[PDB]
Amino acid sequence: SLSCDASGVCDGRSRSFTSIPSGLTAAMKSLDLSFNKITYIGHGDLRACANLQVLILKSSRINTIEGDAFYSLGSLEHLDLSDNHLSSLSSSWFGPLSSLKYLNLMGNPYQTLGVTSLFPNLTNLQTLRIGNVETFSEIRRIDFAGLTSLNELEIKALSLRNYQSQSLKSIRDIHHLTLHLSESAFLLEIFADILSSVRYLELRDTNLARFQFSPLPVDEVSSPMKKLAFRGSVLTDESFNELLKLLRYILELSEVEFDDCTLNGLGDFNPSESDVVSELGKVETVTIRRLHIPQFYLFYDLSTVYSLLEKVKRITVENSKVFLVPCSFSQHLKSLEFLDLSENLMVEEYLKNSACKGAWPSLQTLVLSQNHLRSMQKTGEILLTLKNLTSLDISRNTFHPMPDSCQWPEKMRFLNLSSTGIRVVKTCIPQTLEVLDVSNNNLDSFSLFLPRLQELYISRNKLKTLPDASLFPVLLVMKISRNQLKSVPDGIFDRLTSLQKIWLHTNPWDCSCPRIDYLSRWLNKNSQKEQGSAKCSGSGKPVRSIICP
C-alpha cells in the first residue's frame, strides 16, 4: 500500500508492515519504510530495486538482517537504520554499497561495531553516525579501517568503558566530529588521534571535572581544527585550566563554544603563573550560553583571564546571569569588535563601569538585548565612551519614554529598539541611522524624518496610518506587517524609489473597489518586492487578486 510520486519516491512510512512489501521495482529511487514492525529482512526482500538511492528504515523494530540483504543496492547513497533493535552489526551488509554516502546506525543496542571492519568498502562515505546511550561500550582500532574522509562522524558512547589508542588515527579528514561522552577518562588519547583530521570537534554531555592534561606525544601535527564546542559539560576551575593547555596543539583554533555547561569553582585551587595558561593562539570568537557558576566568588582574583582575551574579536555570553563586565577587564579586550551580552542582569550603574573610558577600544557591535536597562538617554550617554561603535541592539529592554534629544555614539548606523514597550518615537533617535527596528512595540504613528534610512522594521504595532513616504527618501526595506492599516494613499509606494522588499501581511486591508485600486494594482506590478502576502479582511483573498473597473 506504498505510494510513489512520478519521480520514483515511494512512501511506506508508518503503515504497519511486519515485513518488507513484496514486488518492489527498479523504478524506485527512494523507499521510506520508517516506523513499521519489520522484525526480519530476508535475502530477497530488496533484491529488485537496483536503482534505489535512498532507503529509510528508521525506527522500525528490525533485529534481524541477512548478511546479503543489500546485495543489489549498488546505487544506494542513503541508508538509515537508526533506532532499531540491531544488537549485532554484520560486515556483509555494507559490503555491496560502494555508492553509500550517508550511514546512520545510531540508536541500536549493539555493544561494539563487531569483530570485522564494517566500512572498508564504503569509499564515498561522507556521513556516519554510530553508538547509543546505554550499551555502546568499546571503540577499537579496526572500527574505522578504510575510512579516509568524512564530512561528519557522530559517535555516541555515553557508556564507553574502553577506547583503543589510535582507533581514529586512520581517518584522514573529519570535518565535523560529534562525540557524546559521559566522562573524560579517554578524552586525552582520543584527542591525540584526531589532531590531524578533525576541523570541528563537538563534545556533548561530558563531565570534565576529572580532566587532566599530559604532553601529547604525537608527531608534529598542524591541527586543522578551527572549531571546538562543548555542550552540557561539567567543568571545574582546575579542569578548565587543564583544557587551555591543549591549545598548543591546535594552533589554528578560531572558534570556541560552551553551551549549557556548569563551571564548579573552589578556593583550594591556586597555582602559580607557571601552571596557568595565558596564551590563546588564534582564538578569535568565544560563544558562551547558559553558563552556570554555582558559587562565583570561590574564584581567586580573576586576572588569569585578562591575558587570554587580548586578541579575541567576537564574544557572546548570553543568559548566564552577567551583571558586570569589570572595567579593567574591558580595557584588556583591545581587539573586541563584537560583544553580545543578551539575556543578563545589566543595569545603568554597572554598565557605566563595564563601558569605562578605554573600554572595548574597537567595539563596533554591542548587543545588550534582554537586560535590566531602563533609560534610553542614560544608556546612550554611558556608551559615548565607545568611539568605533556602529551597531547597537538594546531590544527587549523596558525603557521609559524617550526624550527629544539624546547623545549616542557618533558612527552609530544601526539601532534596535524592538520589543521595548515604547509608545512614541521622538528625535532622540539620530538622523545618522541606516537601520531602525522599532517592531513589536506600542506605537500609533511614525513621523521621524531619517534621510539616510535604508531599512525600517515597524511590524507588530498599531499604526492606523502608513508613515509618509517622504520621511525615508532612500529606503530599501520596509516591514510594516501586523499593524492596523486599512489603506494606503494613492501612489505612496511609487514614492519609495529604492524600495526592494516590503512586508504588508497581517493587516486589515479594506478591499472595497473604489479604495483598494492603487494598492492592488501596485502589488501586481511589484510582486517581486512584497514578502509574504497581504490579504483582504473579510474574504481573506489576496489583495492583488482584486481588480476595479
Ligand X SMILES: CCCCCCCCCCCCCCCC(=O)OC[C@H](CSC[C@H](N)CO)OC(=O)CCCCCCCCCCCCCCC
Ligand Y SMILES: *[C@@H]1O[C@H](CO)[C@@H](O[C@@H]2O[C@H](CO)[C@@H](O[C@H]3O[C@H](CO)[C@@H](O)[C@H](O)[C@@H]3O)[C@H](O)[C@H]2NC(C)=O)[C@H](O)[C@H]1NC(C)=O
Ligand Z SMILES: *[C@H]1O[C@H](CO)[C@@H](O)[C@H](O)[C@H]1NC(C)=O
Ligand U SMILES: *[C@@H]1O[C@H](CO)[C@@H](O[C@@H]2O[C@H](CO)[C@@H](O)[C@H](O)[C@H]2NC(C)=O)[C@H](O)[C@H]1NC(C)=O
Residues of the shown chain interacting with ligand X in the complex, contacts defined by CB under 6 A: 228, 235, 240, 243-244, 256, 258, 261, 263, 283, 286, 291, 293, 296, 302, 305, 308-309, 315, 317, 320-326, 329
91 contacts ligand U (rule: CB under 6 A): no
Give the three-class secondary structure for 100.
Answer: coil
- The CB density around residue 514, as the number of other CB atoms within 10 Å, is 7
120 contacts ligand Z (rule: CB under 6 A): yes
121 contacts ligand Z (rule: CB under 6 A): yes
Exactly one of 109, 361, 421, 473 binds ligand U (CB under 6 A); that residue is 361
Site for ligand Y in 436-495 (CB under 6 A): 437, 440, 457
Distances (CA, A) of 352 to 263, 302, 324, 359, 373: 27, 20, 10, 10, 11
- Dihedral pair phi/psi, residue 379, rounded to 5°: -70, -40
325 binds, among ligand Z, ligand Y, ligand X, none (CB under 5 to 8 A by kind): ligand X
Cα–Cα distance, 16 to 33 (Å, whole number): 10
Least distance to ligand U from the beta carbon of 337, Å?
7
- Of 22-30, 91-99, 416-424, 537-545, the window that binds ligand Y (rule: CB under 6 A) is 416-424
Cα–Cα distance, 413 to 434 (Å, whole number): 5
Which residue type occupies 341?
L
Contact 504/476 with Cβ under 8 angstroms?
A: no
What the block records as the C-alpha cell of 487 is: 489603506
Least distance to ligand X from the beta carbon of 87, Å?
37
Exactly one of 416, 441, 461, 520 binds ligand Y (CB under 6 A); that residue is 416
- Of 17-25, 92-100, 398-406, 413-421, the window that binds ligand Y (rule: CB under 6 A) is 413-421
340 contacts ligand Y (rule: CB under 6 A): no
390 contacts ligand U (rule: CB under 6 A): no
- How large is the C-alpha radius of gyration of the chain? 30
What the block records as the C-alpha cell of 528 is: 517581486
Give the three-class secondary structure for 3.
Answer: strand
DSSP 235-253: EEHHHHHHHHHGGGG-TT-
- Dihedral pair phi/psi, residue 188, rounded to 5°: -55, -60
Q: Which residue shows C-alpha cell 586576572?
A: 303
387 contacts ligand U (rule: CB under 6 A): yes
Least distance to ligand X from the beta carbon of 243, Å?
5
419 binds, among ligand U, ligand Y, ligand X, none (CB under 5 to 8 A by kind): ligand Y
411 contacts ligand U (rule: CB under 6 A): no
Instruction: Return the closest-CA partner of residue 475 out of 461, 489, 494.
Output: 494
Least distance to ligand X from the beta carbon of 115, Å?
37
Return residues touching ligand Y (CB under 6 A).
369, 393, 395-396, 416, 418-419, 435, 437, 440, 457
Return residues touching ligand Z (CB under 6 A).
120-121, 146
